[PDB]
Design an enzyme around this catalytic site. Sequence first.
Site, PDB file in Angstrom:
ATOM      1  N   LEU A 183       0.709  -1.157   0.091  1.00 54.09           N
ATOM      2  CA  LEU A 183      -0.111   0.143   0.122  1.00 54.09           C
ATOM      3  C   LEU A 183       0.716   1.043   0.066  1.00 54.09           C
ATOM      4  O   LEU A 183       0.327   2.488  -0.544  1.00 54.09           O
ATOM      5  CB  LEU A 183      -0.984   0.101   1.268  1.00 54.09           C
ATOM      6  CG  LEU A 183      -1.915  -1.258   1.382  1.00 54.09           C
ATOM      7  CD1 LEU A 183      -2.556  -1.197   2.914  1.00 54.09           C
ATOM      8  CD2 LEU A 183      -2.836  -1.446   0.327  1.00 54.09           C
ATOM      9  N   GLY A 184       2.038   1.240   0.526  1.00 52.28           N
ATOM     10  CA  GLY A 184       2.905   2.437   0.764  1.00 52.28           C
ATOM     11  C   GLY A 184       4.329   2.043   1.136  1.00 52.28           C
ATOM     12  O   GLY A 184       4.766   0.832   1.354  1.00 52.28           O
ATOM     13  N   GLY A 186       8.332   3.884   1.868  1.00 50.04           N
ATOM     14  CA  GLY A 186       9.031   5.142   2.327  1.00 50.04           C
ATOM     15  C   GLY A 186      10.441   4.653   2.736  1.00 50.04           C
ATOM     16  O   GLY A 186      11.169   3.597   2.780  1.00 50.04           O
ATOM     17  N   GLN A 187      11.035   5.857   3.584  1.00 51.78           N
ATOM     18  CA  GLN A 187      12.339   5.883   4.010  1.00 51.78           C
ATOM     19  C   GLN A 187      12.441   4.795   4.920  1.00 51.78           C
ATOM     20  O   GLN A 187      13.717   4.123   4.994  1.00 51.78           O
ATOM     21  CB  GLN A 187      12.507   7.133   4.876  1.00 51.78           C
ATOM     22  CG  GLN A 187      14.112   7.184   4.938  1.00 51.78           C
ATOM     23  CD  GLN A 187      14.335   8.767   5.826  1.00 51.78           C
ATOM     24  OE1 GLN A 187      15.617   8.683   6.684  1.00 51.78           O
ATOM     25  NE2 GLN A 187      13.422   9.477   6.051  1.00 51.78           N
ATOM     26  N   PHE A 188      11.672   4.524   5.862  1.00 51.36           N
ATOM     27  CA  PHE A 188      11.964   3.547   7.107  1.00 51.36           C
ATOM     28  C   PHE A 188      11.010   2.181   6.720  1.00 51.36           C
ATOM     29  O   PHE A 188      11.090   1.248   7.716  1.00 51.36           O
ATOM     30  CB  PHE A 188      11.352   4.175   8.404  1.00 51.36           C
ATOM     31  CG  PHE A 188      11.988   5.512   8.774  1.00 51.36           C
ATOM     32  CD1 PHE A 188      11.140   6.777   8.306  1.00 51.36           C
ATOM     33  CD2 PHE A 188      13.175   5.982   9.129  1.00 51.36           C
ATOM     34  CE1 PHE A 188      11.519   7.962   8.401  1.00 51.36           C
ATOM     35  CE2 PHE A 188      13.787   7.133   9.299  1.00 51.36           C
ATOM     36  CZ  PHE A 188      12.956   8.241   9.085  1.00 51.36           C
ATOM     37  N   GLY A 189      10.739   1.802   5.627  1.00 53.07           N
ATOM     38  CA  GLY A 189      10.045   0.545   5.443  1.00 53.07           C
ATOM     39  C   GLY A 189       8.737   0.621   4.389  1.00 53.07           C
ATOM     40  O   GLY A 189       8.610   1.751   3.891  1.00 53.07           O
ATOM     41  N   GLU A 190       8.038  -0.331   4.383  1.00 48.29           N
ATOM     42  CA  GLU A 190       6.661  -0.495   3.723  1.00 48.29           C
ATOM     43  C   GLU A 190       5.517  -0.792   4.846  1.00 48.29           C
ATOM     44  O   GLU A 190       5.753  -1.288   5.863  1.00 48.29           O
ATOM     45  CB  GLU A 190       6.921  -1.407   2.615  1.00 48.29           C
ATOM     46  CG  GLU A 190       7.995  -1.453   2.021  1.00 48.29           C
ATOM     47  CD  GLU A 190       8.476  -2.492   0.892  1.00 48.29           C
ATOM     48  OE1 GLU A 190       7.932  -3.780   1.038  1.00 48.29           O
ATOM     49  OE2 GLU A 190       9.250  -2.410   0.016  1.00 48.29           O
ATOM     50  N   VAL A 191       4.216  -0.584   4.024  1.00 46.61           N
ATOM     51  CA  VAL A 191       2.786  -1.142   4.668  1.00 46.61           C
ATOM     52  C   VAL A 191       2.388  -1.783   3.589  1.00 46.61           C
ATOM     53  O   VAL A 191       2.094  -1.497   2.401  1.00 46.61           O
ATOM     54  CB  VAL A 191       1.950   0.008   5.098  1.00 46.61           C
ATOM     55  CG1 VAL A 191       0.580  -0.191   5.775  1.00 46.61           C
ATOM     56  CG2 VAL A 191       2.795   1.258   6.081  1.00 46.61           C
ATOM     57  N   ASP A 296       4.605  13.200  15.819  1.00 40.65           N
ATOM     58  CA  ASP A 296       4.275  13.233  14.464  1.00 40.65           C
ATOM     59  C   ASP A 296       2.746  13.437  13.891  1.00 40.65           C
ATOM     60  O   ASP A 296       2.430  12.465  13.261  1.00 40.65           O
ATOM     61  CB  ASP A 296       5.038  12.145  13.453  1.00 40.65           C
ATOM     62  CG  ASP A 296       5.281  12.487  12.218  1.00 40.65           C
ATOM     63  OD1 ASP A 296       4.789  13.606  11.506  1.00 40.65           O
ATOM     64  OD2 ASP A 296       5.406  11.573  11.608  1.00 40.65           O
TER      65      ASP A 296
HETATM   66  C1  LIG Z   1       0.713  -2.225  10.286  1.00 45.16           C
HETATM   67  O1  LIG Z   1       1.203  -0.943  10.975  1.00 45.16           O
HETATM   68  C2  LIG Z   1       0.706   0.035  10.489  1.00 45.16           C
HETATM   69  C3  LIG Z   1      -0.162   0.286   9.740  1.00 45.16           C
HETATM   70  C4  LIG Z   1      -0.378   1.879   9.288  1.00 45.16           C
HETATM   71  C5  LIG Z   1      -1.444   1.658   7.830  1.00 45.16           C
HETATM   72  N1  LIG Z   1      -0.943   2.463   6.947  1.00 45.16           N
HETATM   73  N2  LIG Z   1      -2.186   2.337   5.869  1.00 45.16           N
HETATM   74  C6  LIG Z   1      -2.012   3.180   4.711  1.00 45.16           C
HETATM   75  C7  LIG Z   1      -2.363   4.496   5.228  1.00 45.16           C
HETATM   76  C8  LIG Z   1      -2.094   5.389   3.727  1.00 45.16           C
HETATM   77  N3  LIG Z   1      -0.790   4.951   3.052  1.00 45.16           N
HETATM   78  C9  LIG Z   1      -0.490   5.783   1.977  1.00 45.16           C
HETATM   79  C10 LIG Z   1       0.932   6.187   1.454  1.00 45.16           C
HETATM   80  C11 LIG Z   1       0.595   7.251   0.351  1.00 45.16           C
HETATM   81  O2  LIG Z   1      -0.201   6.781  -0.537  1.00 45.16           O
HETATM   82  C12 LIG Z   1      -1.442   6.831  -0.315  1.00 45.16           C
HETATM   83  C13 LIG Z   1      -1.642   5.556   0.599  1.00 45.16           C
HETATM   84  C14 LIG Z   1      -0.507   3.695   2.771  1.00 45.16           C
HETATM   85  C15 LIG Z   1      -0.874   2.749   4.055  1.00 45.16           C
HETATM   86  C16 LIG Z   1      -3.106   1.374   6.474  1.00 45.16           C
HETATM   87  N4  LIG Z   1      -4.180   1.300   5.854  1.00 45.16           N
HETATM   88  C17 LIG Z   1      -5.017   0.165   6.513  1.00 45.16           C
HETATM   89  N5  LIG Z   1      -4.919   0.059   7.861  1.00 45.16           N
HETATM   90  C18 LIG Z   1      -3.345   0.271   8.371  1.00 45.16           C
HETATM   91  N6  LIG Z   1      -3.206  -0.169   9.752  1.00 45.16           N
HETATM   92  C19 LIG Z   1      -2.732   1.151   7.845  1.00 45.16           C
HETATM   93  C20 LIG Z   1      -0.185   2.737   9.761  1.00 45.16           C
HETATM   94  C21 LIG Z   1       0.834   2.607  11.057  1.00 45.16           C
HETATM   95  C22 LIG Z   1       1.039   1.221  11.280  1.00 45.16           C
HETATM   96  N7  LIG Z   1       2.229   1.114  12.510  1.00 45.16           N
HETATM   97  C23 LIG Z   1       1.841   1.724  13.726  1.00 45.16           C
HETATM   98  O3  LIG Z   1       0.989   2.404  14.175  1.00 45.16           O
HETATM   99  C24 LIG Z   1       3.079   1.319  14.597  1.00 45.16           C
HETATM  100  C25 LIG Z   1       4.380   1.132  14.095  1.00 45.16           C
HETATM  101  C26 LIG Z   1       5.173   1.146  15.493  1.00 45.16           C
HETATM  102  C27 LIG Z   1       6.435   0.697  15.572  1.00 45.16           C
HETATM  103  C28 LIG Z   1       6.982   0.493  17.005  1.00 45.16           C
HETATM  104  C29 LIG Z   1       5.931   0.663  18.186  1.00 45.16           C
HETATM  105  C30 LIG Z   1       4.700   1.137  17.783  1.00 45.16           C
HETATM  106  C31 LIG Z   1       4.140   1.123  16.624  1.00 45.16           C
HETATM  107  N8  LIG Z   1       3.005   1.179  15.879  1.00 45.16           N
HETATM  108  C32 LIG Z   1       1.583   1.563  16.825  1.00 45.16           C
END
Ligand SMILES: COc1cc(-c2nn(C3CCN(C4CCOCC4)CC3)c3ncnc(N)c23)ccc1NC(=O)c1cc2ccccc2n1C
Length: 428
Positions: A183-184, A186-191, A296
């Site tokens: 889905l995404g 960047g600098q620190f990894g992917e989603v 952030d």
């Molecule tokens: C799986 O973990 C995560 C997932 C997501 C997340 N991003 N996106 C989408 C949103 C929009 N983008 C866009 C990019 C530009 O283009 C348009 C799309 C694509 C992805 C999602 N869509 C549906 N469900 C989700 N959960 C996500 C955010 C944060 C975290 N992690 C943490 O919250 C976390 C890490 C962490 C590390 C250490 C300690 C605590 C920690 N925590 C709580």
Amino acid sequence: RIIVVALYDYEAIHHEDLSFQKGDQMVVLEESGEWWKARSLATRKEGYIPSNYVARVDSLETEEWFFKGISRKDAERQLLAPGNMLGSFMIRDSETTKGSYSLSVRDYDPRQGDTVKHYKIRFYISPRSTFSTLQELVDHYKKGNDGLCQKLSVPCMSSKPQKPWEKDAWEIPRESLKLEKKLGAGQFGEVWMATYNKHTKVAVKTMKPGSMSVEAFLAEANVMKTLQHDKLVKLHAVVTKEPIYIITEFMAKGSLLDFLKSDEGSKQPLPKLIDFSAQIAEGMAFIEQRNYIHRDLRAANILVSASLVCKIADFGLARVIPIKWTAPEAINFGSFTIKSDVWSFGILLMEIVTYGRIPYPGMSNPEVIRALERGYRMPRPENCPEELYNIMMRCWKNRPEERPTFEYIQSVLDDFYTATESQYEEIP
Ligand SMILES: COc1cc(-c2nn(C3CCN(C4CCOCC4)CC3)c3ncnc(N)c23)ccc1NC(=O)c1cc2ccccc2n1C
Ligand SMILES: [Ca+2]
Ligand SMILES: [Ca+2]
């Protein structure tokens, strides 16, 4: 011998959980948190059940119109959600009069449109009509409004709760996952959109090996897992082997930034946009009361579910690992505090009100920094009430100690259209 009853149908998906139907009774064998060991009286099978899917027999929780542990604002949200109509109602635990109950009813005001009115239950609401059971109260008000704003129709639509995560599966093998769609990046990894053991849709964040320590990274994840809240994305699991994967619940509508810019988002009227901001303030008040800092905060780190619930993402991550959202003290001296989050919140409010327009449009980072030192602040956009703008302005005070608390912002945002004297209805 403790007998609980099923509130919702459940379909087993793990090795040892039990399927059951709504109405099925079970004997409890162990009360071990999110999952209880029980024997089904219907199937005679022993296994694990989600403790949030069941209630003690004859409990008020067993009633279709009873909603436990739910606040005034939560009740309004549940009642205005799609699926309800005039007279939709709940009895709930009273938020302010500990140990008592309150009645919430879906109404329609000629000026404001759909609203929710709240009545303290004393049982009686009005001295004139006394009721022995709550069931009796409810039955009366369903046929004619005895001075209520609207007669009672059908109970509030109840959603089936999220399955809790598999028991004792905080650390998981990578093998349990299939990462199906990126889905995404960047600098620190992917989603990635992903599946855990075939059954559960999840989101996975992958970390690039960094300045970070493998062991130091997990200690933060380990604390963050305990800091749970309805307005913080649910942390489910971690893969401890490099590269580290973080598993959260999947948020169907993605980020608030993308949601606001989509066709659906541009259809959200102002009261809805204020409700989003109020959900985010409520997550930040929890973070503030626990004495943490997000660092952030912006619309790119807010996620939206299918039902339009907003949740704070990356709480924890920025503490481990965008100047236009950052307070001048934090840019200048690296003083990140809850007060610099309040600043960021002001900017996010403006992002929300402008449907995801970039802050300080057509200005560069250096221009913004020099302008701010001069006393420049973004001007009030067109569809923004003066009083919402004054909140933003308080968030943007040069002196951090003069900025409001989230507890206070939350309270102003929650009741933005409601006079205090009017939270509860009055019937003599
Ligand atoms: C799986 O973990 C995560 C997932 C997501 C997340 N991003 N996106 C989408 C949103 C929009 N983008 C866009 C990019 C530009 O283009 C348009 C799309 C694509 C992805 C999602 N869509 C549906 N469900 C989700 N959960 C996500 C955010 C944060 C975290 N992690 C943490 O919250 C976390 C890490 C962490 C590390 C250490 C300690 C605590 C920690 N925590 C709580
Ligand atoms: Ca992010
Ligand atoms: Ca009142």
